[PDB]
Ligand binder design. Sequence first.
Ligand SMILES: [Zn+2]
Ligand SMILES: [Zn+2]
Length: 1200
Amino acid sequence: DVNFFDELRIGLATADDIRNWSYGEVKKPETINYRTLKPEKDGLFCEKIFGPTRDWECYCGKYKRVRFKGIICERCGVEVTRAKVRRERMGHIELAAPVTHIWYFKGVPSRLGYLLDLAPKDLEKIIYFAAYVITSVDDEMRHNELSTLEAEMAVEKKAVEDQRDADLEARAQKLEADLAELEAEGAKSDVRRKVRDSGEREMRQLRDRAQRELDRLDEIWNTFTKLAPKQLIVDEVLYRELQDRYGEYFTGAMGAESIKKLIENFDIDAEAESLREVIRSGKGQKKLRALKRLKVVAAFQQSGNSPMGMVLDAVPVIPPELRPMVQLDGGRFATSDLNDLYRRVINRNNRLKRLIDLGAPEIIVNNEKRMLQESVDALFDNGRRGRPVTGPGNRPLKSLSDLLKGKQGRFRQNLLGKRVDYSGRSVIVVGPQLKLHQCGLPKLMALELFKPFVMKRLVDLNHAQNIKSAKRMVERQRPQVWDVLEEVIAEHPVLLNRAPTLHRLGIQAFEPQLVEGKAIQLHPLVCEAFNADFDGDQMAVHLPLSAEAQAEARILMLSSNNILSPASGKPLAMPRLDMVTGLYYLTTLVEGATGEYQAATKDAPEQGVYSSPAEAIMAMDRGALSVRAKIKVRLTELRPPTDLEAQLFENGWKPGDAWTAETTLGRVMFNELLPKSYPFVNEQMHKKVQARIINDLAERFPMIVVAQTVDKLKDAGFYWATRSGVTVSMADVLVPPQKQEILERHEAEADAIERKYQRGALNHTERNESLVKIWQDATEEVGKALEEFYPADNPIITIVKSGATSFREGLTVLEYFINTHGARKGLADTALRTADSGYLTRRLVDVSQDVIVREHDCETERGINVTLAERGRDAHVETSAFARTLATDAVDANGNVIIERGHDLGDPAIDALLAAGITTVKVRSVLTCTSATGVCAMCYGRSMATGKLVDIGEAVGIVAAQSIGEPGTQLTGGLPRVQELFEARVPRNKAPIADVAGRVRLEESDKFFKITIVPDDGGEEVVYDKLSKRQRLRVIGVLSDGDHVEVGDQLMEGAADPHEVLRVQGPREVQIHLVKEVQEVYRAQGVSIHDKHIEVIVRQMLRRVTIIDSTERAEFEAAAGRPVLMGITKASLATDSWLSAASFQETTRVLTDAAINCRSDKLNGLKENVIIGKLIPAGTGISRYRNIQVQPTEEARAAA
Ligand SMILES: [Zn+2]
Ligand SMILES: [Zn+2]
């Protein structure tokens, strides 16, 4: 129980291993006495083997006190020790007949079948007693006696011929007499042919019966001469006759013991060398059939596992506590299915001993071994072969396989996902008055959550005298604890989470504030992250305990420290909904306002000017100044625009200096919210403006400044959202009466046009275009009739303009029916959007979880170019160029270098680059990182969450998977296309790529399109004859006849085979393609994902190569292999960790292949450490971080 083990290894458990594990053989299929209800002896639950029921108490009771431990009672045979051993100790069952392990027999491909060259359909007939197998053969005796055996065989065969020919002549000669009697008697011409037909056919019968015996004889002899071990004799009768004679020359048997023998005399090395034949043709599958099988044969040779392990002589019995039998509440009993499966095994096994001792016939005995064989199969993997064993109600019993795996089973999530103490949940309610780092916690919830803490505090304080006195003091909720509760809660962070958890921001830390009520008060800014509606949504609370946990919450998972989306870098805590309209109304400029500014007239000065913002406030309180007026005022503690100030100053930005600009009091009150160092804005604030502003100020200020600035915007937005006058009513919605009238107007144009179409004015496409012109003219006419009819400041329009976000006439009966037909498809289609996105996100995580930053820099010059603008700004520079690092300097044509290599490439850098007009830039990428382990900080680049360089410990693979899986809910060219890419499957509709460079010859044929490429070598022409016209052409105009094509261009519309572009353009260009297509899907849905996230996933596909002649890349540096592209699922299953891969998909094959290979897991990944409870090798788990030493400086200790 050290908690730090290096490796974890498997292997075939031999009969001895099982016997060594067990604490005694369970001999009876009994559980507990129906009266005493105590465990029966020698049976399941037997305390004499598994363990005592009570601590330090034997079965009889002659030893009861803890005084004696480690001894065994000489009466009941029970060891006096803790009752827990009942959960650690196993038993075993000695089988009267060997049995095959179903995992190596029925497990496809048959591990045993591949190990002995027995087809699974043939092997199934052997171990289940459906055919005999030749175990041994005496070659010398069969050869020395072949002469006499052949003679005796020919003689016996001849005696059959002499009988046959003698019989036919007796039938034909007798038929001649019967027919001769017909001439003397009345001759019926019909009967004459009827008798002959009867006689002739009878001869054929007599002659064919003889032939069949001859063939049976020939069959007997041929099989005996060619008789070789591993041959199967399914004929039984043949086998018996093959045993009556020649029985002393060979041997044969059925069942697992026969398979046990074939494995006995089996030279593993000899069978391998004959399989080492890389010659003997091999281009055909015949060698692959040996190639595929050689893996299973070599695995046993390279390891020490004896292949005998595939046949069990003893079966281990799982401890009772894992298969418990307890009496349910209400008097009823409950017990696991394993007990009924073990019972079937131990019953049939015992009956076999009985039959063996009774000298029963082999039909009965063999029938028992077959029954025993099936009982062990059911015990291990019930249902894997034949119908599963079902109990009352016809439900399949849960075997050990099912118990191991399952979605809710102990393999996938029952082991990974477990319930935790110090937790709780409740419905959430808005907490508009909360600080971003705070959360409303119901007093009762915070009480029970911190119960141990408050118990100690109110005991330290002489309120309660002992612990027990403190417990009741909290349970009864005596009013004296509350004051103690706010202390224990102070500066003690708690974790909030809302299911489902999509990204890491779905869990954040908060300062707990005791709040009246039973609900949880959530800050209104984190809703975006949690995606938390306030329509009854619930959230969970977890209480970090250890000092490390609290440190991780305060530092890593603090709410205020996580503002930017770790997927796009954009801000999530940005104001939204009311806060937007509130600020939109606050800063909007209304012409002709109440206190509007007026230029000095002939006899009066300017009346819109005000001394300070305070004066404007006083003027606002009176009916003088409107918040949205165009007044001009002087400012002393605010910052003027960068461009305007330079004129007014240059000596320095105003710290207390005065300056006058014309704005609105709102815009003044707004800028007061921003930092004092931030220049003035003077604009009506939209989501984007506030989004544009929050970003800009997030780069130039620490997040604490951004955290407080977003909080201040929340208050203002909410405050002015109320004074905004935004309310809905009939006059706000209603209907533009011109619409219904004008709609009936244009409808007449479409009906009479059809009238004109029928007569002869159709003119083909004239109708389709005309009807479209009318429909779009009316559709465009209603927009104006509605947009111009709605006031500019209409509440519906205001909400739309700010960016926070027709049944008005009513529908008749039939109209509403049609609407339901489509509305129900959206709800059902939405059900499939969430399932697959979570199934994709799991595979994504399954393949990239072990990817973490391991070093600051790998120092590789390799990089990837970026298109970066094309106007002569690109539309997607924010996803691929932003937050990158330059592998090479940015050189201008004029010789001036701007932005040096290894720079952060901030948006100001993008503009500085755009200033010099540089189209492309080479950039570091995880696709090119040469890090031996994971990736490096520089290659990865800026962390989207922190805005700075990525920290060394960051586990970017998981963040990438979440960044990709989360938006999967918004996929419609959607989720299937994405899985098509990440899984590396050939495209749904394949598309060709240019295999070389040169011109193109477009040929038009009704059957198919033909694209020939004339190389510029010029060498052999490349023909792409097979082409479906339904696939269209690729766009540049369209690819026409005679155009030039490059080495990687796509010829027709569709998806190019990634495996195709791999061998053509190489690995690096494949990864650029996959990221290109993947990002294009999400971009189609308006989803902003930084390329690096996709790149992290793509990096893991090209990490291995195929070995054509004697896998990862690092092994080759210390025998030719080609770069390989493979899907995430296949790649994940190829991980070095076997229990990690076992938890992923199909645990049986991984477990069987792992046990045979005898693999050892070094616990390198983080999934493994999660299962066993070790510190994951990421974040605070890295060695460099967890081995830090904290010693106070000698100078500080002096101060004391
Ligand atoms: Zn005893
Ligand atoms: Zn690197």
